[PDB]
């Protein structure tokens, strides 16, 4: 039944969560966010916070240049931030993809 | 594990599907009172407002910053479901 709820969030929020895993000491999520503008990334939880890691290897050259004109530069970098700002972040991304 | 995902989506998208239910129906509350409770049924999408529990004061706060149709029950293609969520999200402020 979880499968169906994923499907809902994808159409409702344009986000998909694929896999879950604790490695090192951190809960990591493979996230996919789109609208054909798609930004892949991982969210890792090692609260002491959230660690954002862009996944650009599925991205073609054109798509990268396209995202560059939409996403802030720091979206292509690895970062860290608290949960209070996770929706801020998600929004920032969603808005960027128009 | 499938519940940690529910939580992720909650923080991430500021919307929780309380429960899943002739046709897939879902309980949904959106917001961080300025919170919208509604249901979505998939037959084409069907949007069902849920004012069943709000105070007249809440009904008033919401009706202040929300497009009218948000209070009527309506239908539209899946294709524009997200553009819909954005309106709601960006309306509750």
Swiss-Prot record, chain A:
User: What cellular-component terms does GO give this entry?
Assistant: chromosome, centromeric core domain; mitotic spindle; monopolin complex; nuclear envelope; nucleolus
| Main localization (coarse) | nucleus
Gene Ontology molecular function: identical protein binding; microtubule site clamp
BP GO annotations: attachment of mitotic spindle microtubules to kinetochore; homologous chromosome segregation; meiotic chromosome segregation; meiotic sister chromatid cohesion, centromeric; meiotic sister chromatid segregation; protein localization to nucleolar rDNA repeats; rDNA chromatin condensation; spindle attachment to meiosis I kinetochore
Arranged from A to Z, the UniProt key words for this protein are: Centromere, Chromosome, Coiled coil, Meiosis, Nucleus
Kindly list the places in or outside the cell where this protein is found, as annotated in its UniProt entry.
Nucleus, Nucleolus; Chromosome, Centromere
Superkingdom of this protein's organism: Eukaryota
Summarizing the function annotation, the protein's role is: Component of the monopolin complex which promotes monoorientation during meiosis I, required for chromosome segregation during meiosis. Also plays a mitotic role in DNA replication.
Q: What extra comment accompanies this record?
A: Present with 1920 molecules/cell in log phase SD medium.
What does the annotation say about its assembly with partners? Component of the monopolin complex composed of at least CSM1, LRS4 and MAM1. The complex associates with the kinetochore. Interacts with CDC46, CDC47, GIC1, GIC2, MCM3 and NUR1.
Which protein is depicted? Monopolin complex subunit CSM1
User: Source gene?
Assistant: CSM1
